[PDB]
From Swiss-Prot, chain A:
This is Spike glycoprotein E1. A lipid is attached at residue 423 (S-palmitoyl cysteine). Glycans are attached at residues 137, 204, 264. Class II viral fusion protein. Fusion activity is inactive as long as E1 is bound to E2 in mature virion. After virus attachment to target cell via host MXRA8 and endocytosis, acidification of the endosome induce dissociation of E1/E2 heterodimer and concomitant trimerization of the E1 subunits. This E1 trimer is fusion active, and promotes release of viral nucleocapsid in cytoplasm after endosome and viral membrane fusion. Efficient fusion requires the presence of cholesterol and sphingolipid in the target membrane. The chain crosses the membrane at residues 404-424. N-glycosylated. It comes from Barmah forest virus (BFV). It is a single-pass type I membrane protein.
UniProtKB/Swiss-Prot annotation, chain B:
Residues 73-77 are annotated as: Interaction with the capsid protein. This is Spike glycoprotein E2. Interacts with spike glycoprotein E1. Processing of the precursor of protein E3/E2 into E2 and E3 results in a heterodimer of the spike glycoproteins E2 and E1. Spike at virion surface are constituted of a trimer of E2-E1 heterodimers. Interacts with 6K protein. Interacts with host MXRA8; this interaction mediates virus entry. Interacts with the capsid protein. It is a single-pass type I membrane protein. A lipid is attached at residues 68, 71, 78, 98-99 (S-palmitoyl cysteine). It comes from Barmah forest virus (BFV). Coiled coil: none annotated.
């Protein structure tokens, strides 16, 4: 009744048969449409381009002054003896103790409503498996971690845990432009020598760690303030970027920004278990088949996933058996065979089958052919492992086997013959 | 870029990326040895050239074993008819002896 462990490969139909002796049941075909890495994440920080805002000089005539306060982050220096005038250019009668409150603080732009959010991710795994019982075709989201029962069409499925499963995400930063795999250290970036100068606790924060430095000085000219200004590193670093998370993956993974996922990562194996509601009224149909043969056509040495071959047989038993196979993959799986001849079928060749044990019901042969050495000259591609397989060349290389035997017959004779001489006389 | 049905993606401007498994209007059909091997007939990764290297080394072993044993055989060929029944003037020694002369020299 239950239990196969199928590999995760997308769009390729795995055939599982594991039912009671005598096949007359429903053959299980299962497809992975996509795998769906659903995050269980911690938000490290929000970062964005920033607008530092320096108010224009406010002076108060003569004497000292003192400053105070925070707006998000602040620096404040009160310059003194500002200006040199005494005629309404200081706006004062003093210029020896006259004071300027200069101040600067950090505000956030309008990029901050958009990119970018830093996540530590460890994803939890959801599958989007397609169940084909040969009578309906339907797909279903289900979490594949845990022991997770669902019944669909009133056939039980129990999804067993998924392990040995690739993770692209680690330290990652998700921009709206394109995801990038980048390392950082949160709440400890500042100044303008780095990308992600402002460090913010939340999306709509009021506290920011930045070390940004912009230097006011006292007016001492006929103009109106001297400034040396290092401006924002973020706008500069914006071009340079990291390196993409998208290209990161040995096999599959198209990383989608908006929900935060990776679709189609062909890794991890799903053990599956089922009670398909066997009995039924089994056994009461069971084709049998005779004269089993393999023809090979469409052998080209291009790497594609297709497969185009035929098998010749004859049937005289009218039925549907549960077909086919547990070391081979057909694209068909339901065939009412009443009579039979040549039957062309599609196969998943060079996908996850490079070998095939072809069954049509309880009956079987092993196939097939096409693997020449390096001239090229066709040969069979089955049975013994010799690496162009069974070939006139493979046999000719094997024929060293006689050499060790001839050198052994010479040793046996000489060892026995000495002992015999001493005895002889 | 070579692709043996793995997947290679190229990104060109403001257009969708295209990933390909080198799909054409051809197919395979029960290719590849049951125990792991490389795509197409081609030698690389060496798994078609490994059989050449192995077979070549094997022939040398037959010569090395034959020759070394042979030498020991020639000393027994002298010994046996001498001891058997001398063997000092008989034609009998000669039949065994021809082998022994070829072995030693």
């Amino acid at each position: 009744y239950e239990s196969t462990t199928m590999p995760n490969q997308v769009g390729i139909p795995f055939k599982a048969l594991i039912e009671r002796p005598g096949y007359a049941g429903l053959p299980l075909s299962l497809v992975v449409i996509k795998s769906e890495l659903v995050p269980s994440l911690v938000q490290d920080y929000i970062t964005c381009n920033y607008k530092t805002v320096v108010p224009s000089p406010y002076i108060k005539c003569c004497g000292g002054a003192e400053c105070s306060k925070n707006e998000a982050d602040y620096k404040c220096s009160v310059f003194t003896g500002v200006y040199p005038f005494m005629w309404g250019g200081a706006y004062c009668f003093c210029d020896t103790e006259n004071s300027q409150m200069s101040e600067v603080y950090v505000t956030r732009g309008e990029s901050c409503e958009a990119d970018a959010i830093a996540y530590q991710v460890t994803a939890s795994l959801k599958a989007q498996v397609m169940i084909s019982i040969g009578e309906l075709n339907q797909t279903v989201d289900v979490f594949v971690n845990g022991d997770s029962p669902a019944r669909i069409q009133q056939s039980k499925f129990i999804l067993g845990p998924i392990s040995s499963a690739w993770s692209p995400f680690d330290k990652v930063i998700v921009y709206r432009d394109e995801v990038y795999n980048e390392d950082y250290a949160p709440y400890g970036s500042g100044q303008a020598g780095r990308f992600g100068d402002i460090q913010s606790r939340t999306v709509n924060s009021t506290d920011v760690y930045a070390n940004t430095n912009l230097k006011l000085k006292r007016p001492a000219s006929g103009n109106v303030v001297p400034y040396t200004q290092t401006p924002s590193g973020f706008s500069y670093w914006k071009k340079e970027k990291g390196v993409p998370l998208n290209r990161n993956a040995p096999f599959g993974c198209i990383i989608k920004v908006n929900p935060v996922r990776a679709e189609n990562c062909v890794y991890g194996n799903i053990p599956i278990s089922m009670d398909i509601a066997d009995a039924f009224t089994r056994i009461d149909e069971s084709p049998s088949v005779s004269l089993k043969a393999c023809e090979v056509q469409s052998c080209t040495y291009s790497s594609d996933f297709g497969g185009v071959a035929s098998i010749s047989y004859t049937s005289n038993k009218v039925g549907k058996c549960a077909i086919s196979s547990n070391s081979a993959t057909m694209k068909d799986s339901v065939q009412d065979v009443q009579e039979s001849g040549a039957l062309s079928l599609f196969f998943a060749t060079s996908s996850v089958e490079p070998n095939f044990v072809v069954q049509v019901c309880n009956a079987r042969i092993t196939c097939g052919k096409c693997e020449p050495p390096k001239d090229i000259v066709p040969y069979a591609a089955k049975n013994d492992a010799e690496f162009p397989s069974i070939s006139t060349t493979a046999w000719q290389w094997l024929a060293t086997t006689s050499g060790p035997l001839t050198i052994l017959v010479v040793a046996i004779i000489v060892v026995v013959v000495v002992s015999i001489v001493v005895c002889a006389r | 870029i070579q692709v043996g049905a793995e997947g290679v993606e190229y990104v060109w401007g403001n257009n969708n990326p295209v990933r390909l498994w080198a799909q054409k209007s051809s197919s395979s059909s029960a290719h590849g040895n049951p125990i792991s091997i490389v795509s197409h007939y081609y030698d690389l990764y060496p798994y078609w050239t490994i059989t050449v290297l192995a077979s070549l080394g094997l022939l040398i072993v037959i010569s090395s074993g034959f020759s070394c044993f042979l030498c020991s055989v020639a000393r027994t060929k002298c010994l046996t008819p001498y001891q058997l029944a001398p063997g000092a003037q008989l034609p009998t020694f000669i039949a065994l002896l021809c082998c022994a002369k070829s072995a030693r020299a």
